Amino acid sequence: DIQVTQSPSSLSASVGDTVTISCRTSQTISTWLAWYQVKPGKAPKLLIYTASSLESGVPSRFSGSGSGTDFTLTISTLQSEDFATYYCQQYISLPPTFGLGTKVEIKRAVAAPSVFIFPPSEDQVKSGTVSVVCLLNNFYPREASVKWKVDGVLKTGNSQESVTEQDSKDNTYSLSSTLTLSNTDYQSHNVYACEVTHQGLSSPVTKSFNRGE
């Protein structure tokens, strides 16, 4: 397979900005590159083919350029409708392969997350399997790091994160980190803490509870 590499993975921008996105291939593909726009839950749409040909109906602020192994998508004077994920794709040879995408998201002011920790309810404990939830609410930018600590010790594994799309009104993100343990393991420790690091925080914030208090 011809490897297709996009950069950056994500970029924050504002309406009126000019943005450029890079696509590079592992071997030459001449000008056989397509660009697609995808919005959540919607069908992808073709923007550009043969590296620089604008698909019919697509606004002229979209332009593609490049050849060989190095390609660029330029969006002039970005508009609200352009916040989306963009994919490039080579088709010099089978199989046609896609880059993993560049998400273009809405820039806004830095906002620290509000952090909350939720001890498992008594009926979780009865079930024999418990999930501790840590909530990071209404923050920007997206990048955030959650450490679980159990009796002061770093707990790796058994956690999963989930994040919302950028809020339609305030353009922030919210995120959950869920730690799932057997009740036997859960009962074998006393203090549970999630530690959150984020650009908005001058120092990590730690929320904790003592099990059974």
Binding site: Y49, F98, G99, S114, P119, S121, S127, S174
Partner: protein
């Protein structure tokens, strides 16, 4: 002009055959090349195959070639011996290509029209209603957060509302995650004035239509 619409069962058992069909309209079917592209949760777009509308002759992705069948008013995809990794949104598409010559060499395909896509999930889990656990905290801070953990259900989706939908501001319902158990889990959270926790009741309303399950859970200070 061109319009594509795919269809097929949303659930396939592992080791079985996945079958999706695409309805092609608005165009001369015979004149163009039509095919399939998918995208698994958290993975990239992956071309499966494209065939000629008139002959049925086409080409397949080498990594998928062994278990793929594409035939043709409509196009259809059969993918044999599936696994959980074959969980994906399946898109119907028209594939365009060009001469690469001065020679008999052709390019491969780019895709100028796509259908909406049909989610297909591959899994051995049977239908199962959600557990619903309270996420409870406080009055030293102006705002409180509370929520509902909705888990161990299959298949998606669940819906969550708060106070029969009368509470909407500041609700965040996270996308579901697939557990190692093969069952899904998510949380719904809301932020509220701390000064309200004493007099106002907060209830999450959980609906899981595949199992006809409806749950109301009061969330209170423990």
């Amino acid at each position: 002009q061109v319009q594509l619409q795919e269809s097929g069962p949303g659930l396939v058992k592992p080791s079985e055959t996945l079958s999706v069909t695409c309805a092609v309209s608005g165009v001369s079917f015979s004149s163009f090349w039509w095919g399939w592209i998918r995208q698994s949760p958290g993975k990239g777009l992956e071309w499966i195959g494209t065939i000629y509308g008139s002959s049925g002759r086409g080409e397949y992705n080498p990594s998928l070639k062994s278990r793929t069948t594409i035939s043709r008013s409509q196009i259809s995809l059969e993918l044999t011996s599936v696994t959980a990794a074959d969980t994906a949104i399946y898109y119907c598409s028209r594939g365009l290509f060009q001469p690469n010559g001065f020679s008999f060499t052709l390019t491969s395909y780019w895709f100028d029209v796509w259908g909406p896509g049909v989610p297909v999930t591959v899994s051995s889990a049977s239908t199962k209603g959600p557990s619903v656990f309270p996420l409870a905290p406080s009055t030293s801070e102006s705002t409180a957060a509370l929520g509902c953990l909705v888990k161990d259900y299959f298949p998606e989706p669940v819906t969550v509302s708060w106070n029969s939908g009368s509470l909407t501001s500041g609700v965040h319902t996270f996308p579901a995650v697939l557990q190692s158990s093969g069952l899904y889990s998510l949380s719904s959270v809301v932020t509220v004035p701390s000064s309200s926790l004493g007099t106002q009741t907060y209830v999450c309303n959980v609906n899981h239509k595949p199992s006809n399950t409806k749950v109301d859970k009061r969330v209170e200070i423990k």
